[PDB]
Amino acid sequence: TFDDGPEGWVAYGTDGPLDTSTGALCVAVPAGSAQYGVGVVLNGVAIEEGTTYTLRYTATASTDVTVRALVGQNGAPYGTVLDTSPALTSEPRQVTETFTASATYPATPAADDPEGQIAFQLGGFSADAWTLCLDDVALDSE
Amino acid sequence: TFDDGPEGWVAYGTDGPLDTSTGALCVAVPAGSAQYGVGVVLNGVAIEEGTTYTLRYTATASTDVTVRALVGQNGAPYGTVLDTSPALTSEPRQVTETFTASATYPATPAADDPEGQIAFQLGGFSADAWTLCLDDVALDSE
Numbered sequence: 001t002f003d004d005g006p007e008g009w010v011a012y013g014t015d016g017p018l019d020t021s022t023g024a025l026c027v028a029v030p031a032g033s034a035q036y037g038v039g040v041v042l043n044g045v046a047i048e049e050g051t052t053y054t055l056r057y058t059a060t061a062s063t064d065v066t067v068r069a070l071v072g073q074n075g076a077p078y079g080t081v082l083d084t085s086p087a088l089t090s091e092p093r094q095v096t097e098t099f100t101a102s103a104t105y106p107a108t109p110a111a112d113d114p115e116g117q118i119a120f121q122l123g124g125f126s127a128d129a130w131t132l133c134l135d136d137v138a139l140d141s142e
Numbered sequence: 143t144f145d146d147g148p149e150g151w152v153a154y155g156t157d158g159p160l161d162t163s164t165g166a167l168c169v170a171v172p173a174g175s176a177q178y179g180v181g182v183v184l185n186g187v188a189i190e191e192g193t194t195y196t197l198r199y200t201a202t203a204s205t206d207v208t209v210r211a212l213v214g215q216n217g218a219p220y221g222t223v224l225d226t227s228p229a230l231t232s233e234p235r236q237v238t239e240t241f242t243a244s245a246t247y248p249a250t251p252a253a254d255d256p257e258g259q260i261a262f263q264l265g266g267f268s269a270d271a272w273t274l275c276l277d278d279v280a281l282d283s284e
């Protein structure tokens with residue numbers, strides 16, 4: 001499902017850009033990365049307070065590592081409506097997370113009101129360099 | 143299908159930002175707009191030469207207007223692998239366009255090699271101010 005590319009998704013703090021050549025979106029986390037310093041991110045995610053969503057995704061890491069998968073503000077104060085700590089390994093795991101939104105995020109950045117985003121932050125969790133691959137990422141309301 | 147926002151999609155040259163409150167992505171084209179001056183765009187679209195794709199979308203315009211719907215380079219020299227002229231009106235029309243790609247676009251901007259994109263350029267086609275709404279946009283390989 002990344003076989004046509006990121007199509008909106010971007011990464012930052014990675015060694016080289018993201019790679020979708022395999023069909024999955026993959027990124028190389030630099031060794032010695034900093035918390036909040038490396039991420040794979042989709043901005044422009046509108047969220048309605050009270051609505052229930054399920055975030056789905058399949059991921060792999062080339063070292064056994066726990067990271068952070070979230071839905072939140074793209075901008076100060078970086079509030080979250082989903083905040084998790086997925087443990088990842090070599091073998092694909094499908095994560096499914098259901099939540100009811102505790103806040104509203106606009107589809108576009110406004111004054112005092114950053115757009116929402118889906119974020120996988122990857123930095124700071126392992127001293128070592130490692131690779132994350134992502135596939136089958138979906139987010140919908142219930 | 144825009145009910146959770148643009149999620150990667152962006153607009154430019156519009157009067158105010160894009161709006162997804164209705165479930166469809168909508169944008170207000172300024173009166174007297176310039177060719178190539180107004181658009182709704184998804185960058186990061188990887189394309190493989192020889193591959194066959196179908197671009198789908200449902201659109202409406204608040205004046206009868208023909209625009210440009212394309213898949214091409216996000217960057218000089220702005221080559222295209224699909225180039226069309228959809229006639230749009232008040233009443234929803236689903237367009238389906240099949241093509242075999244005459245070029246390869248990377249998923250990420252490189253040297254001499256801009257990322258690919260899906261683009262609806264809207265400027266320059268009507269002197270009047272008008273609204274475009276978009277829904278059910280999909281692009282896949284056959």
Ligand SMILES: OC[C@H]1O[C@@H](O[C@H]2[C@H](O)[C@@H](O)[C@H](O[C@H]3[C@H](O)[C@@H](O)[C@H](O[C@H]4[C@H](O)[C@@H](O)[C@H](O[C@H]5[C@H](O)[C@@H](O)[C@H](O)O[C@@H]5CO)O[C@@H]4CO)O[C@@H]3CO)O[C@@H]2CO)[C@H](O)[C@@H](O)[C@@H]1O
Binds near residue numbers: 036041119185
């Ligand atoms: O080619 C595709 C497209 O690319 C555009 O350029 C991209 C570029 O490639 C990306 O690298 C860049 O990435 C930024 C993200 O958009 C943005 O969300 C992110 O924001 C982070 C911020 O980096 C981080 O410091 C912050 O950490 C906070 C935590 O979240 C909190 O929990 C904690 O308590 O506090 C810290 C703050 O210290 O988080 C935020 C939000 O997650 O920053 C990334 C790096 O800049 O985005 C560019 C724009 O999309 C290019 O421009 C297009 O032309 C092109 O088509």
Ligand SMILES: OC[C@H]1O[C@@H](O[C@H]2[C@H](O)[C@@H](O)[C@H](O[C@H]3[C@H](O)[C@@H](O)[C@H](O[C@H]4[C@H](O)[C@@H](O)[C@H](O[C@H]5[C@H](O)[C@@H](O)[C@H](O)O[C@@H]5CO)O[C@@H]4CO)O[C@@H]3CO)O[C@@H]2CO)[C@H](O)[C@@H](O)[C@@H]1O
Binds near residue numbers: 108109155
């Ligand atoms: O909030 C979401 C996300 O937003 C990021 O910021 C966005 C911003 O909101 C957009 O307005 C901006 O839009 C640019 C497009 O990314 C980019 O593709 C587009 O490129 C156009 C160019 O504008 C145009 O001049 C050019 O026309 C050519 C034709 O295509 C050819 O046919 C013709 O022959 O020649 C002309 C040249 O004269 O076309 C290209 C490609 O279509 O430019 C838009 C305006 O800048 O993108 C920003 C980055 O995504 C924000 O940074 C994020 O933080 C945020 O999360």
